[PDB]
Scaffold this active site. Structure first.
Site, short mmCIF file in Angstrom:
data_model
loop_
_atom_site.label_atom_id
_atom_site.label_comp_id
_atom_site.label_asym_id
_atom_site.label_seq_id
_atom_site.Cartn_x
_atom_site.Cartn_y
_atom_site.Cartn_z
N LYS A 115 41.24 81.32 53.82
CA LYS A 115 41.47 82.34 52.79
C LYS A 115 40.87 83.71 53.12
O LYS A 115 41.49 84.74 52.83
CB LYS A 115 41.14 81.87 51.36
CG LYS A 115 39.69 81.60 51.06
CD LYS A 115 39.55 80.98 49.63
CE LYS A 115 38.11 80.84 49.22
NZ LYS A 115 37.63 79.51 49.60
N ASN A 138 36.13 87.41 46.54
CA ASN A 138 35.19 86.40 46.94
C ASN A 138 34.58 86.72 48.31
O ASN A 138 33.53 86.17 48.66
CB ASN A 138 35.84 85.01 46.86
CG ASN A 138 34.82 83.91 46.86
OD1 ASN A 138 33.86 83.94 46.08
ND2 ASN A 138 34.98 82.95 47.77
N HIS A 183 33.82 70.91 47.49
CA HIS A 183 33.20 71.16 46.18
C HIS A 183 33.19 69.95 45.24
O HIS A 183 33.23 70.13 44.04
CB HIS A 183 33.89 72.35 45.49
CG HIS A 183 33.88 73.59 46.34
ND1 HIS A 183 32.72 74.23 46.68
CD2 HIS A 183 34.89 74.29 46.89
CE1 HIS A 183 33.01 75.26 47.46
NE2 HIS A 183 34.33 75.34 47.58
#
Ligand code: D17
Ligand code: CL
Ligand code: CL
Ligand code: CL
Ligand code: CL
Ligand code: CL
Ligand code: CL
EC number: 6.3.2.9
Length: 435
Positions: A115, A138, A183
């Site tokens: 990303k 981010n 995560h």
């Protein structure tokens, strides 16, 4: 949006928390700030007029709030935040605040791997066209620090966590590049819960860009696709050479790219699909693909000396990212692979298939070092720290070998962030890798 006269509480400081504080103050609204850390980053930069509570959440403040602005670093499931939601108190994050204000189209990019590379690439495509572009989210600047009336396009890297608190994004073009286990410490309903957070990116998007090779990137219910052998955007192999193709037409021979490797070529396809959908001229977008050199900490050669390549892939914070480094990897001698840190409850077993043969050694450290050594105990060593692992492996390195930090884990148990881990690796490589 109108925030006048609201009681606003910001949870989580740091650069992004500070950008939220500044956003409200510039609009004549004084928020309050809390953070579960005793001395969170940026505390000394918080203006003295802003009340703060640190070391825990303050339920008196939360239940009094009209608006709660939650860092992506605090779980929405935290009992205090869950109580506020049950009470009907509005909870957003910085990306929601940004979306309500932005006056240029937004290209929005998420995924388990790729990303940052794809976000940066689309930013370079826009720069090559002479478009005034704000790139961040981010990575780079928090999104609120990009807000400017002269900006013509925004390109945002968005995490699953940021997406969970966002409702007003209407991206000109949105993608989930891939979804692989990550995560899990924050998603107690497992892979499909994590996926669901990412699927939010497509809501009200004008064009959705999906990975033809990864079914989890597709909406659960007319998307543009990229992939290797399949997709609107795909690769064409031609006798020891590779092309990017759009719907059967050759657009770029990848020998013109500085990046190499299949997953970088599919990152290039995804970036081109997004740029096309955003209305950027194809010609300048292709030119950007030729000039882009890669990000620091992404399979980065920090030293090549005395026949040994030392490679900083500290950005590999999950198993999928390490798999991408190892898959098809060519080493002449022995691979000395550094693994370790906080594995976020991941299953490391998918790595094992890459670790056979007589030319691999593992050096495993950090919180989950023992679990990583267990992948193949006979070629593994365990240490507390990365520095210890480097000093253990260095005397063993021979010409032809590779030393690869691709740790499959977060760095947060022992480091500030993966950049610090990468920088420490590079310092130690330079010390240990020359006479
Ligand atoms: O190695 C790395 O650099 C980080 C690992 C990386 N990061 C994350 O998991 C991550 C998840 C959500 C948000 C972030 C960045 N922002 C952030 C904000 C606040 C915190 C901590 C807080 S906030 C609060 S209140 N109390 C906290 O402890 C931590 C990170 C990072 C990951 O493994 O992908
Ligand atoms: Cl306002
Ligand atoms: Cl608390
Ligand atoms: Cl929201
Ligand atoms: Cl040399
Ligand atoms: Cl082999
Ligand atoms: Cl030693």
């Amino acid at each position: 949006a109108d925030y006048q006269g609201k009681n606003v509480v910001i949870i989580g400081l740091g650069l992004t928390g500070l950008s939220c504080v500044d956003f409200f103050l510039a609009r004549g609204v004084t928020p309050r700030v809390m953070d579960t850390r005793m001395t969170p980053p940026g505390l000394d930069k918080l203006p003295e007029a802003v009340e703060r509570h640190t070391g825990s959440l303050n339920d008196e403040w939360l239940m009094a709030a009209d608006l709660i602005v939650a860092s992506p670093g605090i779980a929405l499931a935290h009992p205090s935040l869950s109580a506020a939601a049950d009470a009907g108190i509005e909870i957003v994050g910085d990306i929601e605040l940004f979306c309500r204000e932005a006056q240029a189209p937004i290209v929005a990019i998420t995924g388990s791997n790729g990303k940052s590379t794809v976000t940066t690439l689309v930013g370079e495509m826009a720069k090559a066209a002479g478009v005034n572009v704000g790139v961040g989210g981010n990575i780079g600047l928090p999104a609120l620090m990009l807000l400017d009336d002269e900006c013509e396009l925004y390109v945002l890297e968005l995490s699953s966590f940021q997406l969970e608190t966002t409702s007003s994004l209407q991206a000109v073009a949105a993608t989930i590049l891939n979804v692989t286990e990550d995560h899990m410490d924050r998603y107690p309903f497992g892979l499909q819960q994590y996926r669901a957070a990412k699927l939010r990116i497509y809501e009200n998007a004008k064009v959705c860009v999906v990975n033809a090779d990864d079914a989890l990137t597709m909406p659960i219910r007319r998307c543009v696709s990229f992939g290797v052998n399949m997709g609107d955007y795909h690769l064409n192999h031609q006798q020891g050479e590779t092309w990017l193709r759009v719907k059967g037409e050759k657009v770029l021979n990848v020998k013109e790219m500085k990046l190499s490797g299949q997953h970088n070529y599919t990152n290039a396809l995804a970036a081109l699909a997004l740029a096309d959908a955003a209305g950027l001229p194809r010609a300048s977008s292709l030119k950007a693909l030729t000039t882009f050199t890669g990000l620091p900490h992404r399979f980065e050669v920090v030293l090549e000396h005395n026949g040994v390549r030392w490679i900083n892939d500290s950005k590999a914070t999950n198993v999928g990212s390490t798999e991408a480094a190892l898959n098809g990897l060519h080493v002449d001698g022995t691979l000395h692979l550094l693994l370790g840190g906080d594995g976020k409850s991941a299953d490391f077993s998918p790595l094992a298939r890459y670790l056979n043969g007589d030319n691999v050694r593992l050096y495993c450290f950090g919180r989950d070092g023992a679990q990583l050594a267990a992948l193949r105990p006979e070629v593994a060593e365990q240490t507390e720290t990365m520095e210890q692992a480097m000093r253990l492996l260095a005397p063993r390195v021979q010409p032809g070998d590779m030393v690869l930090l691709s740790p499959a884990c977060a760095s947060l148990d022992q480091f500030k962030n993966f950049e610090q881990r990468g920088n420490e690796f590079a310092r130690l490589a330079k010390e240990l890798g020359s006479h």
